[PDB]
C-alpha cells in the first residue's frame, strides 16, 4: 500500500466501529472482590515515595500505563489491492460527573475539625488519544534515569535496551524507542508519542500539572475528529488491524492517612468511521 | 421512520416550544414553608460524609439528580411525518444571585468572623441534551461500595437488582439506564452514554476543585444547531421531545463545621422544530 | 409594525448615537461632598452581613443595581394610520467598559498586603465580577431569582420581588418562578442579585452577560474601539425601537476593595460606553 | 482632508516605519548611574502608601505613565494627499528577563531565606494605540481625594484647574485630555476615550490581583489591521504619526517591608503606511 | 539574489528535514555519569541567589540558554539562481508525561509528616521556537544591569559590547544586540528575539510566570505551522543553511534541602518542509 489511489465504492465500502478502553491506573481489573483490591479498580494503589536521592523504586501498581486495543476489521483481499482507511473518530471521556462524589472518606476540606466535604480528585491531568493503522510509536523520556523500575510487570527503557537507563534518557535519546503493543504495560511517565515516526497514526495530547489543580473536562456526542492528513489520506490499516491508544488521568484522591495519593483515570469511547481505499 | 426524506412545507410546518427546567439539587420543591425545609429549595441539604472506608451512606437529599421533561408536540399522522428538532437556544438563569455575599455563610475572615459571606464556589457541572427519546445513561461511580438508598433514587442496583461491582468504577456496559424521570437519577452515577444516543444531542462540561470561582456566560443571541453530519436533527418518536440538564454552580459553606450545600440554577430551552417526511 | 420590510434609503436614513451609563453600586451620585458620602460614588457602602440564618437585612446602599437609560430617537411617522410605517432599527453597537487602569492604584488605604508590618501595597480590587449589557427597542425584561427567599430587602429604595407581587417571596423564588417578573424601567433601583435578563421574553432586545465568582479572583477586562457587536437576529433584523425609544441596560462589577477595619468590603463598578448604529426600516 | 478618495500609486507611495517605546514606570531614564537611581530604570520607585483615609500622596516616581512618541512622516503636499496607517506589527519585548529568579527579591522561603528570588507577579496592563493625532484620554480615578503632585505629572486638576470631584470616580466628561507628552500621564488616571479617537485605534487589557502569574505572547508573524469598517486607516494630520502604549508586567517585592516596584517592558511598532488622495 | 521569482519544479525540488533539539537548562550533556553530575542533564544545577542588592552572580549552570542547530541542506546551483525556502514546520515539545513522576525525592506535599507526593515541576514556563534562513537575531534586555554574569562560558551583553551593562539594558537599548550562533551559550533571561530584525526568520513565543503555576502543554502530530509571509514567501536559506532555535522551560523542581530549585526543560522536535525557489 505504497501508492494511494481512488476511494472504493459499492456495498459495504464504508464501515463504523466502536470501542471503549478502560483506564490502566495501576490496580488490575482482577481480583473483582471489593475487599481484596478490586475497590481500587479505576485508580492506582497508594503512591510510594523515594527514600533517598538514589533510591526511587515505584510499585508497578502505582504507575499509570497506556491503554490500547487492536480491533480486527472486515476481510478485504492482482497488483491493485484495498485497505481500510480511518477517516474520522468521535471520541469521548466518560464519567467526569462521578468526581462530584464529595461524600466519601478522602482527606476532608476542614482538617482542623475533620469536617466539610471529602476532597474531590484534583491535580495533574493527562489526556492523550491516538488512532492508527499500526501500533503507536513511542519515545522514552524520564524524570530520573536512576529510577529503579521493576523488571517484571512493566515495559520500561531497560526492557527494550537490555541496559540501564543513561543520562540522555532524561532528554531525547533516539535509542530509547518502543511500540505500544500491549495494554496496561507501558508507563505514561516513561513513554511518549514519537513525533519522528507515527506516519500512519494521528495522536492528540495535553498535560496540566500542579497538585490541587481543578480538573477540567468537556464531553459531547457532536464533535468529530478528522483523521485525514494534508493530502486527504487517513491512517491505512495494515493487515486490517486498527489501533486505538489512550490515557486519561483526572488527578489524585488523597486519603486521611499520611496524605496517600491515588491516581484516578476515566474510560474513553471511540467511534471510528473507515472506508475502503484502492492501493498499489 | 427509518428512511429520512424531504422537509415538509406549508402552514404549521415549523414550530417553536419553550420550557424551563428547575434544578434538582436534593431538597424537593415541597414543603414550600421557609422554616420546614423549603428554604433549601434550589440547594442540596447538608452533605453528609462517610464514617469509614467501608461506610459511605449519602442521604438522597444530598445528591444532585438530572432534570428532565418530556414535551408533547402537535399531532401529525406509505409516507409519514415526524417532528425534527433543528436547533435550540438554551441559557442558565440566575448567576447574578451568586452576588449575594451578605448572608450567613462561612465568612471570608474566620479569625475575626468578619468580611463577607463566602459566595458559592467549587465544583461545577453543566450538561444539557435535546432528543427524540429519553437520554441514554451509562453508570460509573467513584466507589462501588457506596451504599445508596434503595428508595427515592434510581441507582445501578435499581437497574441490575444486584450490588455494584468493581467494574462500575470504570466502564461496565451492563450498568445502563434511560433518563425517564425528573429528580431521580444522581449525576455522580449516571452519565450520557456515548455508545447510544443516536437520536439525542448532548453537551457537557466539568470543572472541579473546592474553592474554584464559578464561571458562567449567558446571552439570548446564541443558537445551538442540532442537525447531524447528514443535516438531520433528532426525530421525535410519538411526538415527544426530551429535554435533560444539570447545572451545578458549586457549594455554599455554613458557619457550622463547614457544612456544604450544592447550588443549582434553572435552565431555559427554546427549541425550533420542523416537520420531516419519513418512510 | 410587526411585518419587517426593506431598509429605508436617502438623507438621514442612518444615525449613530452615543451614551455612557455610570455604575450604580450603592452610593448615589449625591451628596457630591467628598466627606459626606460622595467619596463612595462608584462604589457600594460597606457590605453588612446577616446576623443569623433568619436575619438577613442588607442595606440598600450595599446592593449594586442595574444601570439603564432610555434614549429618544427622531420621530419617523407623522401618521400612524399609514399602511406602511418606519421604525428605527439598532444594527450594531460598539460598547466599552472604561477605567480599568484606575484599579492600578495600589497606593491607597485598603487592607495592606503585609499585615505584620502594615506595609506592602494597598490590596487592589479583587473577587466576584459581573458584566452584562443589553440594547433593545423596549425595556429589558427581567426574571427574579434570589439566593434566599427569606432575605429581608427594604421595601422602600429598591424594586424587589415583593414590590412586584405585593407578597413575600416564596421558596420557588430561589429557582425559576415565572410569577416573579419585572421590566428594567428605572436606573439604580433593580438589584442585580435579584433581577436577571428573562430568556423567555426579550424578543426585541439583545443581551450579553458573564459572571466570574470567588473572593480574591483577579479581575480581567479587555477594551478597544475596534470591536463591533452585531445586533441583527438570525433573520437580519435588529431591535426595533417602539415609539422611537432605545433602551440601554448594563452592570459592570469589578469586585471589591477591602478596608483596614474588620475586612469591610465595598463593591467597585465601572461606567460603560455605547455607540449604537441605527437605520430606518420599513414595516407594516 | 475630510473626503477620502483613491489610494495613491507610484514610487514611494507606501512606507514602513519602526520605533520602540521604552516603558515609563516611574524612575526616569536619567540619572544613568546604577547607584544613584538608574538601577530602577524600567521600574517604579518603591510604592508609598496613604497614611490615612484622607491622606493619599503618591510619589510621581511611583506612578506608571503612558509612553508616547510622535513620528514625522515623509513630506507630502483641491485634491491633496495624506499618509494612512494601514497596519501595525507590535510586540512587547523582554518577557524572558522575568526568568531571573536569582536576585535579591523577597525569597520563596522567608523562614530560612532560601528558595528562589520571587519573580515579578501581580497586576498587568497592556495597551497600545496608533493614530493620526494624539490619543484622546478620559480621566477616571479610584479616589477623587488622592493628592497627586501638581508638578511633574499631568492629572485631572492640571486640566480643569480645580480639585477632582466625586464624579471623577466614575465617568465625568469634563475630565478629558490628550496624550501629548511621554512619561507624564498616569495610567491609573487616564484611559482611552471611547467617545473620541475617531482617528486612532487602541487595544487594551487588564488583569488584576497581587500574585497573579504574568502572561505574554510574542511573535513576528502577527499583523494588526488598522483599517476601519470602510477600509480607511488613521489619517496622519500634518504628517505626524502617534504611537502610545503602556506594558505593566506586575511588581517585584523586596526583602524590606514588602516594598513593591512596578515592572514595565518596551514595545516595538512596525507601521505600514500608504498615501491616500483626500479633499 | 534578493528578487523572489517562481517555485522550482521537477525531481528533488521539495525536501523534508527533521531534527530534535535537546534543552540547555544549565548542566551540560557530559559528564554522562549519573553520580558525577549527569543526573542533572535536562535540568539546571541548584539556583544560587544574590547575597545583597549589589552582589548577584548566577552560576552559568543555573541559567537556561537557547538551543540551536544549523542544518545543511542539499547543494544548489547562470544569472538566475535557486535558494531553499522553508514553507512550513511541524514542531512538538516531547516528554510532558514524564512530569507525572510524583514518586521521587522532591519536597513532599505534606511537610508535617514528610509524606503525600513528590511535588511535581511547577512555576514559570517559557516556550519559544524559530525557523530561519540565518541565525536568530537577538535583542538583550535584563532584569538588573548590575548582575555579575560570568565572563567565561556564556555570551552576555558585555561579551558583545566589551563594556559593562548600563541602565538602558533594563529596557530596550539598541546597542545590545547579538545573533544566536551557538547552542547552550545565550541565556534566555538576557537574549530575546529581536523584532526590529529577523526578516528571514519566523519566531513564536510565550511566557507564563509565577512560582507554583501548573505547567500546561499540548502535543499532536497533526498541527502544521505555515512559515510563508504576507507575500507567500518563506525564510530563504543563505548558503543552504537552515537555522532552528528554541527553549522550552516547564518550571522548577524543588528539593528537600532548603528549597533548592532546579529548572526543567524538554526537547523539541522539528519537521521542516522546504522547496526550491528561483531568485535573481
Ligand atoms: C500490606 C503491606 O504492607 N503491603 C506492602 C508489601 O508488604 C509485603 C506483604 O504484603 C506483607 O504481608 C509483608 O508483611 O511484607 C511484604 C514486603 O516485605 O510490600 C510491598 C512492596 O514489596 C508494598 O510496600 C506494600 O505496601 C503497599 O504498597 C502499595 C503500592 O505498591 C500501596 O502504597 C499500598 O497502600 C495502600 C493501597 O493498598 O493502595 C493505600 C490505601 O490508601 C490503603 N487503603 C486504606 C483504606 O487505608 C491501603 C491499605 O492500608 C491496605 C494495605 O494493604 O489495607 C487493606 C486495604 O484497605 O486495602 C485492608 C483490607 O482489610 C484488606 N482486605 C482484606 C480482605 O483483608 C486489603 C487487601 O489485603 C489488599 O487490598 C490486597 O491488595 O488491604 O494501602 C501499600 O499498602
Ligand atoms: C434533625 C436531624 O437530626 N435530622 C437527621 C435525622 O434524624 C432523625 C430525626 O429527624 C431526629 O429527630 C431523630 O433524633 O433522629 C432521626 C434518625 O435517627 O436522621 C437523618 C438520617 O436518617 C439525618 O442524619 C438527619 O440529619 C440531617 O441530614 C441532612 C442530610 O440528609 C443534612 O445533613 C442536615 O443538615 C442540615 C440540613 O438540614 O441541610 C444542614 C444545614 O446547614 C442546617 N441549617 C442550619 C441553619 O444550621 C440544618 C439544621 O441543623 C436543621 C436540622 O434539621 O435544623 C433546622 C433548619 O435550620 O433547617 C432548624 C429549624 O428550626 C427547623 N424548622 C422548624 C420549623 O422546626 C428545620 C426543619 O425541621 C427541617 O429543615 C425540616 O427538614 O431544621 O441541617 C442534617 O441535619
Ligand atoms: C454611623 C453609623 O453607625 N451608621 C449606621 C446607621 O446609624 C444611624 C445613624 O447614622 C447614627 O447616627 C445613629 O447612631 O444610629 C442610626 C440608626 O441606628 O444605621 C444604619 C442602619 O439603619 C447602618 O447600620 C449604618 O452603618 C453603616 O451602614 C452602611 C451600609 O448600609 C455601611 O456598612 C457603613 O460602613 C461604612 C460606609 O460608610 O460605607 C464602611 C466604610 O468603609 C467606612 N469608612 C471608613 C473610612 O472607615 C464608613 C465610616 O465608618 C463612616 C460611618 O458613617 O464614617 C464616616 C466615613 O468615613 O464615611 C466618617 C466621616 O467623618 C463622616 N463625614 C463627616 C463629614 O462627618 C462620614 C459621613 O457621615 C458618611 O459617610 C455619610 O453617609 O462617615 O462606614 C456603616 O457605617
Ligand atoms: C532617603 C529618603 O528618606 N528619601 C525620602 C525623601 O527624604 C528626603 C531626603 O532624601 C532625606 O535625606 C531627608 O531626611 O528627608 C527628605 C525629605 O523628607 O522624602 C521623599 C518624599 O519627599 C520620599 O519619602 C523618599 O523616600 C523614597 O520614596 C520613594 C517613592 O517616591 C521610594 O519609596 C523609596 O524607596 C526605595 C526606592 O528608592 O525606590 C525602595 C527601594 O526598594 C530601596 N532599595 C533598596 C536596595 O533597599 C530604596 C533605598 O532604601 C534607597 C533610599 O533612598 O537607598 C539607596 C538605594 O538603594 O537606592 C541606597 C544607595 O546607597 C544610594 N546610592 C548612593 C550612591 O548613595 C541610593 C540613592 O541615594 C538613591 O537611589 C537616589 O535616588 O539610595 O528606597 C524611598 O526611599
Ligand atoms: C560542592 C560545592 O560546595 N560546590 C560549590 C563550589 O565549591 C568549590 C568546589 O567546587 C568544591 O569542590 C570545594 O569544596 O569548595 C570550592 C569553593 O567553595 O563553589 C561554586 C562557586 O564557584 C559553587 O558555590 C558550588 O556550589 C554549587 O553551585 C551550583 C550552582 O552553580 C549548585 O547550586 C549546587 O547545588 C546542587 C547542585 O549540584 O545542583 C543542588 C542539588 O540539589 C544538590 N543535590 C542533592 C542531591 O542534594 C547538589 C549536591 O549538594 C552536590 C554538591 O556538589 O553533592 C553531590 C550531588 O548530589 O550532586 C553529591 C554526590 O555524592 C557527588 N558525586 C560523587 C560521585 O561524589 C556529586 C558530584 O560531586 C557533583 O554533582 C559533580 O558536579 O555532588 O548541589 C552547589 O553545590
Residue numbers in the entry:
A (entry chain B), E (entry chain A): 33 to 109, 114 to 316
B (entry chain C), D (entry chain E): 33 to 109, 115 to 316
C (entry chain D): 33 to 316
What does the paper say about this structure?
Murine Polyomavirus (MuPyV) is a double-stranded DNA virus that can induce tumors in newborn animals. Viral attachment is mediated by the major capsid protein, VP1, which forms pentameric capsomers that assemble into the T = 7d icosahedral capsid of the virus. Sialylated oligosaccharide receptors are engaged in a shallow groove on top of VP1 formed by loop structures on the protein surface, similar to other polyomaviruses. The differences among the three strains have been mapped to amino acid variations at two positions, 91 and 296, within the receptor-binding region of VP1.
The laboratory-derived RA strain shows limited spread and induces few tumors of strictly mesenchymal origin after a long latency period, while the naturally occurring PTA strain has disseminated infection and causes multiple tumors of epithelial and mesenchymal origin within a short time. While RA bears a glycine residue at position 91, this residue is replaced with a glutamate in both PTA and LID. By solving the crystal structures of RA and LID VP1 complexed with GT1a using the identical strategy used for the PTA-GT1a complex, we found that the overall binding mode of GT1a is very similar across the three strains, with a conserved binding mode of the [α-2,8]-linked Neu5Acb. Although the replacement of glutamate with glycine at position 91 leads to a contact area decrease of 33 Å2 in RA, the orientation of GT1a in this strain is not altered (compare Fig 5B and 5C). Due to these steric constraints, the GT1a complexes feature well-defined electron density not only for the binding epitope, but also for the non-binding, branching NeuNAcd in its preferred solution conformation, which brings this moiety to about 5 Å near the end of the long arm and gives the glycan the characteristic, horseshoe-like topology that is observable in all complex structures. The GT1a glycan exhibits the strongest binding in all three VP1 variants compared with DSLNT or GD1a, with no detectable difference between the strains. The stronger overall binding of GT1a can be attributed to the additional [α-2,8]-linked sialic acid present in GT1a (Neu5Acb), which contributes several interactions and an increased buried surface area. These contacts seem to outweigh the differences in van der Waals contacts with the side chains of E91 or V296, at least to the extent discernable in our assay.
